[PDB]
Symmetry: D2
Subunit: 389 residues, 4 copies
């Protein structure tokens, strides 16, 4: 039915890193033009662009639109943003598939973009503050990383799952390191060369080409890892190390019918066979990828053991472990090239980021059936099933 023609992600940038001053939509256009070029499709053939983005504050009117226009998609087309937090990137892909499945469109670009780096501070000041201190709110912490129900960090939900699945400091540390290593290796074997399209951070003192994931640490040791203090709970288990970071990035996918691809002689990066989204308690939102991964497989008629390759987003070691334990798929096919503890977690783009890494790596090893899935703040999961053609 619906296939992914092509895909691309920018490298994933460290917080205030290569993209410190690069507005999301600039990362997005690059990625739009990327899927386009790789597919042999002209921008004038794009009906719509759908982009997950949690933090567009201050970036001006509809950053999705801006990104599509800069990428050369004509004014005739349409563009919008959407927000299911860390699910946004993956969900945008599903919402775009559904544009084609309902016949409301023929060709969509979909994914996510996020500049956590560029997120402003804000305060409501219309009424006027008559007397006293007021807080300038970090929209990155407030609108993306803080649970609107208990008022604590996602980091706390992690701790929750930790004590609920009794995961030890070390057990999680072990997860992180393995991730860090798997990521470093993959990078060396050039396993990211394909999916990554380079971004030119144009300066005034000179242009800089970013085409490599700068968040991944080489020479990751469990022992400097073990030296870190917990980031949230004063006597907790979760650390800056066994948890993903704050990052800038973008990623997307050219969607069209399987029929359309044939006519254009395109070798699709895969076929979207199913998807699901499901909720759970906000206090353990990191469990979301479990009900979601099951409803998705259910809808596919796939058994947990049909999966050749999985991409379960590593929002946290504590929760990724929980996911892995509860569903119990073969960990050797889970995050073969390292997860987000190493690569980085650009909120609104993370879902499409892992989608790319799934698809290119599926191609790489000729795997038939893959899955990708992420946890979502507020208490949700999102998952998708892909099958090679």
């Amino acid at each position: 039915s619906i296939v992914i023609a092509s895909a691309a992600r920018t490298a994933v940038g460290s917080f205030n890193g290569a993209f410190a001053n690069t507005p999301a939509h600039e990362l997005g256009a690059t990625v739009i033009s990327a899927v386009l070029e790789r597919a042999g499709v002209a921008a004038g053939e794009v009906n719509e662009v759908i982009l997950g983005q949690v933090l567009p504050a201050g970036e001006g009117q509809n950053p999705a639109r801006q990104a599509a226009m800069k990428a050369g998609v004509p004014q005739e087309a349409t563009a919008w943003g959407m927000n299911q937090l860390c699910g946004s990137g993956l969900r945008a892909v599903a919402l775009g598939m559904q544009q084609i499945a309902t016949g409301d469109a023929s060709i969509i670009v979909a994914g996510g973009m996020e500049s956590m780096s560029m997120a402003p501070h804000c305060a409501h000041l219309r009424g006027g503050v008559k007397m006293g201190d007021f807080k300038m709110i970090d929209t990155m912490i407030k609108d993306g990383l803080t649970d609107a129900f208990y008022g604590y960090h996602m980091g706390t939900t992690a701790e929750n799952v930790a004590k609920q699945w009794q995961l030890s400091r070390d057990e999680q540390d072990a997860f992180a390191v393995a991730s860090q290593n798997k990521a470093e290796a993959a990078q060396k074997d050039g396993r990211f060369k394909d999916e990554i399209v380079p971004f030119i951070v144009k300066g005034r003192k000179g242009d800089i080409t970013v085409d490599a994931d700068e968040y991944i640490r080489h020479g990751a040791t469990l022992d400097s890892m073990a030296k870190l203090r917990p980031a949230f709970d004063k006597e907790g288990t979760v650390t800056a190390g066994n948890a993903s970071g704050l990052n800038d990035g973008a990623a997307a996918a050219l969607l069209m019918s399987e029929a359309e691809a044939s006519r254009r002689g395109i070798q699709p990066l895969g076929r979207i066979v199913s998807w699901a989204t499901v909720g759970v308690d906000p206090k353990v939102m990191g469990t979301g990828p479990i009900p979601a991964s099951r409803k998705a497989l259910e809808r596919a008629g796939w058994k947990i053991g049909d999966l050749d390759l999985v991409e379960a987003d590593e929002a946290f070691a504590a929760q990724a472990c929980a996911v892995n334990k509860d569903l119990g798929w073969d960990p050797s096919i889970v995050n073969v090239n390292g997860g987000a503890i190493a690569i980085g977690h650009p909120i609104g783009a993370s879902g499409a980021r892992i989608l790319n890494t799934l698809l290119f790596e599926m191609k790489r090893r000729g795997a038939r059936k893959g899955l990708a899935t992420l946890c979502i703040g507020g208490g949700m999961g999102v998952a998708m099933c892909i099958e090679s053609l």
Copy 2:
């Protein structure tokens, strides 16, 4: 096969007025509660809440999930927000319709919520400001009213449609005057009591019930309309009087399959027969509703003259006059109870707001074929065809 089982909107509040300190998700909760109540559907049956919102800055993670959970919908359902500017409110309905149409959901509550009063000022400060003055950006003007591409105000784009369509000052003045009068008469005659669910503004100094649109001005005269100076060009045509305002409000629909409604003995407000969205030159985004309104009538197999009732949004008098003039539908069926020039333009929820007025006026005057449409910054249109059952 997809029907709007029910619908509800808040009264629309004036800028920094009755909802001055009411966050969007709260108006959204009251509205989600009501549609469930008016359809006789339990919160526990809601598969997903989809809410349009342009200005979430500062409101915390996924406000949609915030409205949903406050409305009683269980942690097991899902929620997300989307932004296609003034088109958001309607688009969400279209997206929700798709959820059930693809067989991914049974029951959605969709629409939007906007608090332009609560919108904060922001500034990007992570690098720090080494030296000199910097600007605190008003996210309402920046993310909602400012064209990303030409940098001027939506009002300036109206001036564009004004010059392109040669619409004089008195021409728009009269348009606004009628709007105001039709809004005042509709309010007095009680034609708004149906679609409005009362909102309780909890105040430390006592509670207040808001159930009336407070933006409508009683006794709008052509003369006082012509005493105003241009709001966007020293020697221009657009004024405060012939443009919509800045407003707060929320509005939703409850969709399910036509079969589902029959199983429940629910008499739907309408069936969604078609929808569309098109793009145009950002300079004249006001023209947006023309390609969209048409594309929607075509997808429906309807002639223009087939329409019994039309809701075509009045972002500005200039642009609405233009849309009416092109499509040439009988004006006396356009904005029968007045438009956003009087009632208000709560951006994110505006699309769902006109859909509300549409449905309840279609029911009371017994109209069969209806359509709402809105224009969208960055040059875009949205439209939906509805039909009673």
Copy 3:
């Protein structure tokens, strides 16, 4: 040897009231002009302007110079501000006196100005904020009303005095009401007309003449007072009703030698016979006037009983009561016309505001010896002895 040739003060304004948008130096300018007119001295003859000012953040370079220049004092003269908190207004007079005393100047305009309304919110942003919320600090509260040592509001220093001196809520309220009633009598009898110079608040739509203390309430009851909640301690004793207020205003004196005055045929308001400032524990800063008044009297060779009229500043009812109790002066010659609780308390100006009231009441009643004194945040007091010529 040094006399006060003339005096003047603006009306004292309410917080965000009459002078809500008037910069301190504009208030300053008017007052400088007044003491000039009243003395028959030309702007051209001024040597220096000394103005106490606590909260000048954001007002531009050396506001004191801005005022002198706005008043047509020549560029060849000099101006500066100084800051001894609530003691600033009077201290500036002692400082002006010294200039002349040491032969370094002949004619000084001295006093204070304050717009607490105009005081801005600020934050150090150079280093930048990587992550998280920061506080926008209210400079008024931070730089004028909070103890830098103990972290608490001046009101809390007042509670400290109330406990040590065992002054009850009722003893305090009574003092406050008495202050209000005296001030109201004085205002109604016109006893403030001499000292006050009108100030014209320029405004787009209409200029407004402010020539009456607007913060003085009429017919205020012991009852309403007794019903107020403690403002600084949820189970304290100090309230908004028995503390001074937050206010805008300016006040000045024109200093010159007794001989210079005699050559000019000026009949001075008084002779500055001595002054003094002394420190005390910051925790009980309201006791400052006790030591300071004693030192000043001792310097002047006066017994407390020699005083005919006293202006003992009312920062707080608690401290005002403590001062009188320790000092023992006939309370019926203290704040004869009411004090800061009823009149207002523009910190940087307050010292000069009471000097104005002292001087003009001494004149009208034929009093020979007077004293003025204020308490000083952070643990200080200042006083000045005046003798009629």
Copy 4:
């Protein structure tokens, strides 16, 4: 009559450099301690602390008092700040001397402290901002560096002086380069060691001792000077190179009578023989030292040629050259160890910084008669004559 018993200044820090996070009063405290220790006088004997300070916004009530308490000056003593812009530090000493001269105090510690690095951005938000962008004002620029009357930067008055005196770019550069070279020589010869007191920047990450002027560049070349662009007028002559810096630091002197000094067996750095402050046109504010020095010399009974040593502050090469040409003093006795262009210019402390450099160099080379002088924004100059004992 009045002598300077001892003196001390901190190393002068670079903008956001060594003291990027060090509040002025912390620098002030160290320097109060230093003068005490140096004179052999105990903290308990201090009567009053007078500290010039131009940018105290955000530091809290009366930083002067905070500095004094931190150095253990007793609570019974007093403290205040004052502001004559760049003249503050020197003016504070004249003020301090006056306290003693008029018999009101015996022991005074006076000078200035400034943390331009810690100066915050601010904005007046009490009235509320109904809509639209607003400025966060940099207090350092607004309250320290911008003329209040013409609205331009101090550097523009420097340009004005350049034209009037016809000072070429090359001649300004030569002056600046000479200054850098004189400072480098003194620093390496150890000529700044006597005046400097170490300051420990207390870092959680291990303490740091700051005891050298970090702003003084080594091996600077006339060639890189000459390439620099004009910083204020895009076709002017004044640049970052031939203009002074933005700096942090503090300086003070312990004051007491000659008789008192003798009774304690102290050998004073010098006798204050006279001082003066004079106004000039704000447009050429950099000319202040001309009439101020002349007034001081005259008051001292001295001819210009009587001077053995001079500290004429170097706000800008252009003004320094004007002053030297008008006064005619042998340039080889002016700023013998380099000036502000090379050392730094922390507004409020500058006046007392050059007092330090003057005093120790006078002691070092047995110079008998010296003079310090600085220009002041708003059109003023201050100067003081010193004589050895």
